[PDB]
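Throughout our pipeline, every protein is held as a single compact record rather than as scattered files. This encoding replaces a full spatial description with a residue-level series of whole-number codes. The remainder of this section carries one protein's record, kept here as part of the documentation.
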Amino acid sequence: SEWTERKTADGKTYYYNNRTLESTWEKP
């Protein structure tokens, strides 16, 4: 488990990063 791919009710799969505390919306 490296990146959190979770679906927010907005209909978006947001990649939230709690490892370094960063919000990523574009997959590296």
Remarks:
- The radius of gyration is 9 Å.
- The chain has one domain: 1-28.
